[PDB]
Amino acid sequence: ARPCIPKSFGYSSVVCVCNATYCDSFDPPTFPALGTFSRYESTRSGRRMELSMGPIQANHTGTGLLLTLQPEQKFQKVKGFGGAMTDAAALNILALSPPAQNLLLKSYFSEEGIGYNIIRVPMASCDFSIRTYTYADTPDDFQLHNFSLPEEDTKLKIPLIHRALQLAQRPVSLLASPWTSPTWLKTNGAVNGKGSLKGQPGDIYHQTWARYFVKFLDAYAEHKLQFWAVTAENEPSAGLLSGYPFQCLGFTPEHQRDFIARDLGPTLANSTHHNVRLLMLDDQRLLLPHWAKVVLTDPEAAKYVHGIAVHWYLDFLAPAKATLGETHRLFPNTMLFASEACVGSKFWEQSVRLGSWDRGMQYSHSIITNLLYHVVGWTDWNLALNPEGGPNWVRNFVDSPIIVDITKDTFYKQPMFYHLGHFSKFIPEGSQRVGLVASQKNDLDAVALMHPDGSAVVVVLNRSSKDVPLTIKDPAVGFLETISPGYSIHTYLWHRQ
Ligand SMILES: *[C@@H]1O[C@H](CO)[C@@H](O[C@@H]2O[C@H](CO)[C@@H](O)[C@H](O)[C@H]2NC(C)=O)[C@H](O)[C@H]1NC(C)=O
Ligand SMILES: *[C@@H]1O[C@H](CO)[C@@H](O)[C@H](O)[C@H]1NC(C)=O
Ligand SMILES: *[C@@H]1[C@H](O)[C@@H](O)[C@H](O)[C@@H](CN[N+]#N)[C@H]1O
Numbered sequence: 001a002r003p004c005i006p007k008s009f010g011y012s013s014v015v016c017v018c019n020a021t022y023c024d025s026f027d028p029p030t031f032p033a034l035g036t037f038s039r040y041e042s043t044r045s046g047r048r049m050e051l052s053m054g055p056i057q058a059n060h061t062g063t064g065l066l067l068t069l070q071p072e073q074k075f076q077k078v079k080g081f082g083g084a085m086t087d088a089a090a091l092n093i094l095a096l097s098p099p100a101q102n103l104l105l106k107s108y109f110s111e112e113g114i115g116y117n118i119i120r121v122p123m124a125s126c127d128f129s130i131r132t133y134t135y136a137d138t139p140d141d142f143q144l145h146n147f148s149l150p151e152e153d154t155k156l157k158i159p160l161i162h163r164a165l166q167l168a169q170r171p172v173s174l175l176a177s178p179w180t181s182p183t184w185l186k187t188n189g190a191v192n193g194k195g196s197l198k199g200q201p202g203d204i205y206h207q208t209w210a211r212y213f214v215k216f217l218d219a220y221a222e223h224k225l226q227f228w229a230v231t232a233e234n235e236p237s238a239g240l241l242s243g244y245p246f247q248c249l250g251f252t253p254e255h256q257r258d259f260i261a262r263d264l265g266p267t268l269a270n271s272t273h274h275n276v277r278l279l280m281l282d283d284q285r286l287l288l289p290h291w292a293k294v295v296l297t298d299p300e301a302a303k304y305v306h307g308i309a310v311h312w313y314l315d316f317l318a319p320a321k322a323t324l325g326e327t328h329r330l331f332p333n334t335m336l337f338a339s340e341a342c343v344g345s346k347f348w349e350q351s352v353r354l355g356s357w358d359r360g361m362q363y364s365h366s367i368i369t370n371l372l373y374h375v376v377g378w379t380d381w382n383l384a385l386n387p388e389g390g391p392n393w394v395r396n397f398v399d400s401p402i403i404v405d406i407t408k409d410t411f412y413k414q415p416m417f418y419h420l421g422h423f424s425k426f427i428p429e430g431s432q433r434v435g436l437v438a439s440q441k442n443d444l445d446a447v448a449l450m451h452p453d454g455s456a457v458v459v460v461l462n463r464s465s466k467d468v469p470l471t472i473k474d475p476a477v478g479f480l481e482t483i484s485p486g487y488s489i490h491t492y493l494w495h496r497q
Pocket of ligand 3: 126127128234235311340342345381396398
């Protein structure tokens with residue numbers, strides 16, 4: 001293990017400072033002996049995923065908070081956790097010296113870090129790019145004879161994805177999302193603003209756009225990268241808005257439905273990439289369940305849709321049950337997956353707030369709410385940004401768990417990094433959420449899961465200032481007596497036999 005080198009930037013908590021020769025890292029994962037539990041703790045006061053162990057007690061008495069495991073109450077199985085390899089993320093990472101690059105990638109993807117097993121890949125340019133480009137900018141190239149990956153893919157994104165996959169012990173899943181089509185496929189002839197595909201589903205514009213997906217997957221496959229899934233479009237609602245400032249492609253739910261049924265579904269199904277999953281929506285959960293009903297009550301569309309991708313704007317609030325809950329109830333066999341989450345969105349908020357414990361708590365609160373409402377995965381936005389929260393060609397700056405200081409050959413691991421880690425490191429793919437009931441009203445957020453091997457994991461977040469004594473009951477083993485300190489997050493792990 002190497003501990004956090006803490007640094008204050010004058011906000012509520014510290015960042016952990018990493019450079020070419022030093023980064024905080026875990027010892028190789030270990031199992032707690034039966035009758036004992038493992039605790040990982042992070043606190044505003046400065047603890048960063050610190051490991052301790054205690055006994056599981058056969059007996060318990062008290063009037064104190066009891067969380068009871070309900071291991072026979074089984075919910076969703078987990079796909080995984082990770083973040084986005086944007087042009088901005090890749091340019092920042094590759095601006096560090098090679099040894100520093102390796103420590104940053106190890107922080108995210110290694111068992112010595114937090115075990116990310118998802119990477120979201122933009123299909124060409126987004127706002128977290130330093131120029132606008134698509135893979136097919138030659139006007140009216142319906143055959144896509146001038147389709148090609150620029151340097152952003154071949155020199156920045158692809159080599160970093162190879163290196164991330166080399167460092168991971170878990171199999172990593174790639175998720176691809178487009179922001180814009182070529183401008184000659186669009187009613188407005190521009191990468192941004194209000195505009196959809198020209199013509200009607202089934203026509204040459206719609207078929208060229210579907211074939212563009214296959215050309216993307218073919219080009220990544222020539223670089224020995226295979227995708228788990230694609231989304232039908234990043235934030236299709238954005239391209240319906242007049243003056244939308246960055247790359248978008250407008251679809252109504254009806255247009256997405258007919259595009260999937262007539263073009264994208266059949267085209268992927270007839271390709272060598274037929275095993276790639278398609279996720280619909282990839283947008284705000286306020287659009288649910290209406291968007292899911294429009295698309296999935298048409299069997300010609302539904303037979304191609306594996307899942308519903310959702311976006312979180314953490315600065316803002318929204319109701320989970322009415323959106324994620326009702327959607328699961330209508331379409332229980334169509335997985336919900338959180339594909340994008342960001343903080344620092346509002347006009348009056350600093351883009352990057354180095355050492356913000358509040359933004360850490362926003363991430364962990366959001367992941368717990370998602371896991372409590374059937375969501376199988378949770379994908380951060382940019383893996384790394386600069387201290388301004390860029391680069392970003394429209395100055396749409398936001399925060400990132402890792403901030404790169406190129407002038408210092410340094411990177412800072414924010415509280416958000418550790419809040420994400422409390423989930424990503426300890427909830428492997430195939431983990432199943434199970435029931436967890438409180439004996440009394442309490443200020444804590446918690447969720448329980450069982451690993452594929454039958455072991456238990458519980459995450460407990462305390463967003464209050466008050467220490468909360470509590471016991472976790474598992475009927476198979478006994479009682480974990482513990483305390484949730486104010487402004488803390490804990491992960492608890494134990495074997496059940
Ligand atoms: C990278 O960070 C490490 C850890 O903070 C720095 O190593 C420390 O260097 C100082 C000053 O030389 C010593 O007082 C400490 O004993 C070192 N700590 C450890 C844990 O080794 C290192 O100097 C930094 N590298 C650069 C180029 O700034
Ligand atoms: C399209 O690609 C071909 C073959 O690489 C090339 O000769 C041609 O000039 C390209 N056209 C444009 C407009 O780039
Ligand atoms: C999600 C969106 O797809 C992405 O382009 C954007 O940068 C973030 C944060 N800011 N904004 N707008 C999300 O919207």
